[PDB]
Structure formats: structure tokens, C-alpha cells
Symmetry: C3
Subunit: 53 residues, 3 copies
Amino acid sequence: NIDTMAKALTTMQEQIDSLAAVVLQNRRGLDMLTAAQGGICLALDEKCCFWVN
Amino acid sequence: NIDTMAKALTTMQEQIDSLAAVVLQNRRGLDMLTAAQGGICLALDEKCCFWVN
Amino acid sequence: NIDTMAKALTTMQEQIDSLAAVVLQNRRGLDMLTAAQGGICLALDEKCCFWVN
Ligand SMILES: [Cl-]
């Protein structure tokens, strides 16, 4: 019996971790699609954004 | 601060849902771009990541 | 061993920021891939989803 406001924190962490999974997969999807351009980061000529878990 | 923590949770929750919308849309975009390959997950040859709730 | 909550909020916020960066970059990637169609949103014939302010 704890979790007073941390119940919203736990649900959010679940959402974040899950969303990250989708985002990273989307990133792999984009890097796959833009392999000819060296990946999506290179294709966009921008610094690469990574997950930090 | 307590009230600050509540506000932080509130905004972050709103940020999560907003981001999730962009992510899901990006996912639909990727699925469209790889529809012929069965979607981005099948194209990626990976277990698909979903974001529900 | 005290106040993990307040700290968790900051950690989560940065996680969201980090993720948003990837998501936005992915969106730019998708818009680039569908530039001829006016971006992924228009390519998907959907209302564009955006990140918070
Ligand atoms: Cl994404």
C-alpha cells in the first residue's frame, strides 16, 4: 500500500517505454527506407537523435 | 515542490499523449510507405511494436 | 533512499524530451520521403499530429 501519485508515474513510464519501442522501430524503419542516404539522420543532414532509455 | 510535481505529471502526461499521436501517425506513414512489404514491421522483419492506451 | 518521486519526474521529462527528438526527427524523415505528396500527413490524408510547445 504505497503509490500515491506514483501510480500516474508508473503508468506513464509504461507508456513511455512502449512508445519508445514504437519510435525506435519507426526509426529503424526510416533508416531502412533511407539506407541509400545513409539512414534517416544522414538523409536529413542532421545530428542523429537516439533513445537513452 | 508538491504542486510542481502534480503539474509536472500533468504536462508530461499531455506530452506523452501528444507525442504518441505523432508516433502513431509516423507508424501509419511508415506502414503506408511499406504497404507492399506488409507494413513497416514486416518490412523490418521484426516483432511489431504497438502503442494502445 | 528518499524523494525518488521528484527525481523520477525529471528523469521521465528528459526521457520524453529525448523521445520527442527522435519522434520529430522521424517525422522530418517521413515528410522528406513524402515531400512530393506534401509531407506524411498529407500523404496519409490525415490531420497532422504535432509535438507540444
Ligand atoms: Cl516515431
